[PDB]
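Researcher: Going back to the complex we discussed earlier. I've cleaned up the inputs and rechecked each line, so this should be the final set. Can you rerun the prediction on the complete assembly and write out the structure?
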Amino acid sequence: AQRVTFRRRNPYNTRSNKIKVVKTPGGILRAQHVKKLATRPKCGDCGSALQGISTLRPRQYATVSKTHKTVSRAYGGSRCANCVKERIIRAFLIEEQKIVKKVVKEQTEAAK
Amino acid sequence: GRVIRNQRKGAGSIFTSHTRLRQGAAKLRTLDYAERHGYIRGIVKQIVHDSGRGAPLAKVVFRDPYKYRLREEIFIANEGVHTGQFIYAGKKASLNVGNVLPLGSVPEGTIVSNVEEKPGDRGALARASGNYVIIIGHNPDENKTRVRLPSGAKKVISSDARGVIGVIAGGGRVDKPLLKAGRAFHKYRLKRNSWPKTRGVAMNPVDHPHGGGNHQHIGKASTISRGAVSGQKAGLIAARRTGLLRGSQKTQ
Amino acid sequence: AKFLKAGKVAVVVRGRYAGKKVVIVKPHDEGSKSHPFGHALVAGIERYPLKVTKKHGAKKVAKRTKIKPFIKVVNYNHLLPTRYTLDVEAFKSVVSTETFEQPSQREEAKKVVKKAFEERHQAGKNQWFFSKLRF
Amino acid sequence: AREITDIKQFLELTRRADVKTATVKINKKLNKAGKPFRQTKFKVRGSSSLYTLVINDAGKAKKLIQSLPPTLKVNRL
RNA sequence: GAUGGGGAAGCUCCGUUUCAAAGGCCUGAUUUUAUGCAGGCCACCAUCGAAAGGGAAUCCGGUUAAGAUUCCGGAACCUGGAUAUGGAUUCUUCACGGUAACGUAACUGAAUGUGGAGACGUCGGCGCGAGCCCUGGGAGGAGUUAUCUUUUCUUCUUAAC
RNA sequence: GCUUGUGACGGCCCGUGAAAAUCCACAGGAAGGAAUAGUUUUCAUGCCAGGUCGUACUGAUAACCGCAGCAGGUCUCCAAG
RNA sequence: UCUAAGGGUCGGACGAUCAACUUAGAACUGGUACGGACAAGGGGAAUCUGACUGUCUAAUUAAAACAUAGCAUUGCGAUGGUCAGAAAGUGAUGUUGACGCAAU
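Model: Rerun complete. Updated structure for the full complex:
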């Protein structure tokens, strides 16, 4: 039965004027404006939430230690482990089959 | 009387196209040495809905021949094409669905989409959900190919004009009744201010030729000379005939 | 048939050393206590040698060809077995179950594998293995 | 802001430099069994954080008050 | 909505990357100098247009006749700029560990490229949080008490970081 | 339970439901780097600065618009038994 | 005023502990009253007419008028149809292309 007010001239229930309610040490109820929630950085070749990488709003990553926004593998943020595991394989297998794609057409060159 | 509705459209205003949500515009690659002489392989990264246009788009990306970077074009997607698909473009590209070949490089029978009207214009003909053009024959008396357009008409364009093998995707969208005004509302909402439509016959004379009253009716042939002046062209425009047919085929 | 051998070269396909070339040196096909699974004692590079042009100076070349090594226990499943093969003799010794635990021993090992590898790369006996594999 | 627990690393803080003042608070708290004992908090105002060290053993506490630099403005109570 | 332009007797109309020679970012040379220059990449590119859209960062207590997320007290955070000490790194020069998902107090990185966040509809049930609502014991204060009720009311709070 | 926030799902479309500033990251390896000594400010700590304009109050059966202290009109948030 | 049924948690077909209200039934009772105030559909048979939901004459007309989905006709392959402008290196449709745009 205690009621509250926005603490900033914006009187409309928009996304940036989200509000929380807090009991203060005064023993009094008060609004407190709440920032909008962050989202998980996503993996840039499958779109999945990057494991190990922190979840701040974008400018916050400039106030954060590097360990918070990478992991220790080829493609720290960027891509997603199963996607670098696929990635290496695909590299190796093709570069191999190149050599072959190559040698095999050099054989059928002599055959002519 | 008053400027009629159909004349007010020319002025843009309330009648321009609703385009905020549109993806980019849909085009072939710009025609380069790659495509003029060989082929160039892109992948289709995503395929995507475009507001106002049933028929989905393919966002397909290619390497840049003259600079180290990637280049994304926006194709119209062609039914069967699928993310992770390689897309080959140009004179030497092989006859698979999804590729883009010069008309002059495909056999008679081949069916294609998004075909250029002049080589290099980046795609003009057969672009809407479901459509395509058929190559009927070729004529190396100047590099020309003769085709069939979705409308019925045959047209002869340059064998250098490119098409993409296959039909435009988006099925038979029109096969489903719209059912309720609201569906048309949302329909035209992503297109343009053309809906609902008041009949001229329910307007007064100031507003339209149909206009006057005492009983609703047109009072003169609704069949207008092509040379009539704007203000007067409402109805059936240079109608070579009028009335119910049951027609069944076109021009062949 | 049964390849997993003494001097097989393979690509680490997971974790930190993901993407890098190595040679198995002690196969342990059976499960270890800690390590209850098919695994292999390997040694590959961690920082490859850099490229070398005619235009390169004296000690530049001497610098552009240092090689940071590494040694790992690694699950067979985190390996891309290759058709290529590299002789394991000079390090054969330094790399055993022993050298794991006690950092210094892992350390003295790397000291040796590095001398060996840098050696191998001069007068290019065995190449390929010295290039990055790019993805 | 911060709480400190290494009674030693505390002691470096008490000299440190930027640390002109500090304070000793005393609470009449009570343990899990519930017997009135003497908790004593050592607050140290550094430039940009307030490191408060909490000592529950009354013995070691009343000792440590005589281990602060004599050139630090300890506010008592 | 200016501009190279094109119409118009003209007030001006059209056009906005447009049929245009449309820039400026690093730093070497030079240490006559902080500076003209030698490198060089990248640029179909005015601007105005949101006090409800997007967006760097603050909270609680106290205070006035009238101001307060603005003053006071205390406790923070962001941005730009300076910088030194510590720590980390290296004779295997640009860190280790973990099979792996990944871990971390850090762990050089120009051009160029590429990816992500900014970033997005509506309805429904289901799960969870917060505040609120109801409520037992107890420590206080108020109320009623001809008669009854271990009773009725009420205080028991915790901010950003 | 109420109000709100939020998640993992599901229904809907011939509707599939902005943009730019801005911030980070990866790929790349130009280049700069130690042994009597250098590298490094995406780790901790420390120094400095943060301008201009608005900021009262009403917000409606009397502070706005309807000649007015007009039974009309005028956008929103909070919500007890 | 009673009866019965519908959960949770923890110890091995029971055993301990915590916690809700809701539902069906039965007896008793009254000046036969009880959704006791508040709240809250009258129903049926037909004819004319418009399919429906939607719309308009702000201040005398809300309707059977307008819309609509559905049906049909007409023009156009871009050197184009329809429309704009005094003129233009001018403009709408058009980020379009006949499963489209335009006109009835």
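Model: Worth noting: Chains B and A do not touch (no CB pair under 8 Å).
Researcher: Good, that matches what I expected from the previous run.
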